[PDB]
Amino acid sequence: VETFAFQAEIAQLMSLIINTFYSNKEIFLRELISNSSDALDKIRYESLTDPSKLDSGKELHINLIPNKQDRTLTIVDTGIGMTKADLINNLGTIAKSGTKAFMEALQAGADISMIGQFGVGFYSAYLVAEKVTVITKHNDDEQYAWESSAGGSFTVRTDTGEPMGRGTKVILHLKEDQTEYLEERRIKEIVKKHSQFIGYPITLFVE
Ligand SMILES: O=C1OCC/C=C/CC/C=C/C(=N/OCC(=O)N2CCCCC2)Cc2c(Cl)c(O)cc(O)c21
């Protein structure tokens, strides 16, 4: 297991998301579904020029899996996934400009729900989660687990859990007072409100 420090501005964004008083937390689900949709668009796009990219799985979909016993909400997609370099470096690098644009916009009157307009909507997960684990598999690399409870650092390790073929699984370890996002009717409401036109099937698993 390797420990990395977030780029400073990203550590600052996560402190802001964690510490700002902001009741409209439900948007985190829209943002992560949107990220899954964008990851699915990428492998679909690349597959048109190279059909061998779907050898790791043709199905393009999103599953929502709540688990009251683990207090986890898991978003699973079969999109393009992330390499080790993606996890540690690339996405963080890309997110620098968006994080700065976002912080400035919040200075000028925007609110937290607008985060996804800046390409950094993943960090809205920390509105509801004390810890986030991401398992991912990209066609060009092995399976990895990334994890952070914020505080300025994250870790990455090889994952030898059940193999996933290709894609990303985001595991939201929910804060004690956010267990409403484990409820079936709450999840349906929010998907209906915010993610009505996503062009992949979203399956809400029940308990
Ligand atoms: O694999 C994913 O994107 C790969 C293709 C890129 C698509 C554009 C949408 C952005 C998505 C993401 N931005 O990450 C922000 C980030 O630095 N870190 C650290 C590494 C762990 C993931 C979060 C990662 C991602 C997220 Cl977050 C997701 O909820 C679903 C996903 O399928 C993917």
> Which amino acid does the sequence have at 91?
L
- What's 30's domain CATH number? 3.30.565.10
53 marked among binding-site residues:
no
Q: Which two tokens stand for residue 63?
A: 């599953």
To what resolution in angstroms was this structure determined?
A: 2.0
**Burial class for 187, CB neighbours closer than 10 Å (0-12, 13-18, 19+):** buried
Task: Provide the residue count of the chain.
Answer: 207
DSSP single-letter state for residue 29 = H
Question: How far away, in angstroms, is 156 Cα from ligand 1 center?
Answer: 14
Helix or strand (DSSP H, E) at 49:
helix 27-49
Tell me which of 134, 137, 141 to substitute to probe ligand 1's pocket, judged by most ligand atoms within 8 Å of the beta carbon.
Answer: 134
Question: How far away, in angstroms, is 142 Cα from ligand 1 center?
Answer: 16
Helix or strand (DSSP H, E) at 204:
strand 202-204
> Which amino acid does the sequence have at 97?
S
* d(C-alpha 162, C-alpha 55), whole Å: 18
**Burial class for 105, CB neighbours closer than 10 Å (0-12, 13-18, 19+):** middle
Instruction: Give the method of determination.
Output: X-ray
* d(C-alpha 190, C-alpha 77), whole Å: 18
Q: What angle do CA 97, 103, 107 make, to 5 degrees?
A: 140
**Residue bearing the CA closest to ligand 1, atom 24:** 35
User: For the chain, how many structural domains are there in total?
Assistant: 1
* d(C-alpha 145, C-alpha 137), whole Å: 9
CB 147, CB 155: distance < 8 Å: yes
What range defines the domain where residue 188 resides?
Answer: 1-207
Q: Which two tokens stand for residue 134?
A: 């991401």
